[PDB]
Each structure stands twice: as C-alpha cells, then as structure tokens.
Symmetry: C2
Subunit: 156 residues, 2 copies
C-alpha cells in the first residue's frame, strides 16, 4: 500500500493543514514546533503509548475554542491486478468496506471535548467511506488496529 | 452498598487467597509485600491509571506457571425495602442483572496470557451471577465502570 494524504482539522498548532503523503517521507522547515507536532499527531494516530494518555487541555488551537480534533489518514488499499497482495491486505478487517470493489481506505481520529471531566476520550474509527464511519473493535484494551501497524520510534 | 468479599486467584504474591470485606477496612500485619500487593490489586480493579498500563511479566506467581489472573469483588447491590437507594444504585447498569429480584453483584478482572506479544491485555467483565459474565462497554478509552467508582489515593 501507499499513503496518500493527511488532514489535521485541529491540534495544538494546526488549523486546516492538509499534507499529501507517500512512502519515505522527509519533513523539514523553519518551524520546529510544527514538525514535532506533526510527528506527535502521527504518534497519536498510530501508537498506543501516546493514545492511552488521552488529550490534555493544552493540546488545542485555542484552549476553549473549537474543541473538535480530527486527524484523518488515507491508505490506498488497492494493489495492482498482477499482484495478489490485495486480498491479504483487505482480509485483516471484514466489515469496514461494504463493497469489494472499493479503492481507498480511511483511518480517522476523534476527540471528545474537554469541558467536562477534564479528559480527552480518544475515539478511533476506520471505514472505506467518510460517511457512516464505524468504530475500531477493541475487545479488551488492545484494539484491532494495533495488530496491523507497529510503530518503532527512534530518537537520540 | 456494602463490600462482601474479594478473591485473588493469582497475583505476584497470592495463590488462593479469599478475604471477606466490608466498609471501612483496616489491613495490617508483618508481611508488607502482601499488603501493598492487595492495595495494588485494588488499584488494578477500580483505578484506570494503573489499569491502562496492562500486566507485565513480573506480576505472576511464578514467571511462567499458572498464567490466569482473576480478581473478583462482590458488591451486595440490594438495600433495605424502606429506602429508595436500591433503584438509583441499580440504574447505573441495565443489561448486567437479568432479574429485578437479584441480590448480589459481581465485578471480575481477567488477564490474557503473557506468552505472546509481551502485554497483559486487561479484560474486565461484571454480572449479577458468576456464570455468563458480560463485558463492560467501553466506547472510547473510558469504560462504564469508570463513571461508577472514583478512587482517591493518599500517600505522603
């Protein structure tokens, strides 16, 4: 598969940033805070060690305005017709894609507002279409996405 | 509501320990490790900040023998017939208790084997009877038992 794009609808430093993606991505620039918050957004979407802590009040654009954090990722689930990797790639999930002829896949994140109980409540949803998004099945503490993607973080 | 008993089927220091319970409990003795492991078992049951870390390899009786941790707490859900706290105590849950004339309530903890993937995977289930225990619905990172019990831990 091949990553297509990422949209961050709200974060601690982002307002409506949409970045097209691929494999072997390289990020640079003047703003170090934006790069480290992009990497923290990737950790929040793709790792359990940052997901289990929840969202804190300081991780918003304004600390009380527009309390709705959405981080969307696209997967491009379809492979070539000469390679049989499509069925092995699809068969990890069953009910996410309604039709077998779908082209792309979505992974989304949703944050409950921090007005009451002062806690983030990370909710993970996937699905083949943006409308009628469905939850990720977690039978205990480990959800179904954690068996698919393993994130190894390297920092000197 | 009045605690009845606690059963620890396996822990880092317990084998077949069953302790009767009540409110306003005082624990003392020569063995400090048993007291702190009893308190840690209570923290693993009713506090989320220790529940979210899962179980390690060292939290077993022997490090490869009898990998089945069960911690059972009895609740005594029924109250007196002249006080209307019974309905307000029952109405936090709906599908756990099959009959309205049920007397006792169970809260159980289950830990998967640590042989594969090196993680504990805490599974929590409650129910009015010991058999056919149903899972607590956790829609995000917070289950329904979190809104019931608030644990305040004091240690200088």
């Amino acid at each position: 598969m091949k990553f297509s794009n990422i949209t961050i609808k709200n974060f601690r430093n982002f307002e409506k940033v949409n970045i097209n993606l691929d494999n072997k991505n390289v990020i640079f620039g003047m703003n170090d805070i934006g790069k480290t918050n992009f990497l923290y957004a990737l950790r929040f979407l793709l790792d359990k060690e940052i997901r289990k802590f929840g969202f804190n009040k300081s991780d918003y654009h304004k600390h009380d305005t527009s309390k709705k954090i959405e981080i969307i990722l696209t997967l491009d689930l379809s492979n070539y017709e000469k390679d049989e990797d499509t069925k092995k790639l699809i068969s990890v999930v069953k009910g996410a894609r309604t039709s077998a002829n779908a082209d792309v896949f979505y992974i989304a994140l949703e944050s409950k507002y921090d007005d009451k109980e002062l806690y983030g409540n990370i909710i993970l949803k996937w699905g083949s279409e943006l409308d009628n998004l469905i939850d990720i099945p977690g039978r205990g503490n480990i959800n179904a996405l954690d068996n698919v993607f393993k994130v190894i973080y390297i920092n000197p």
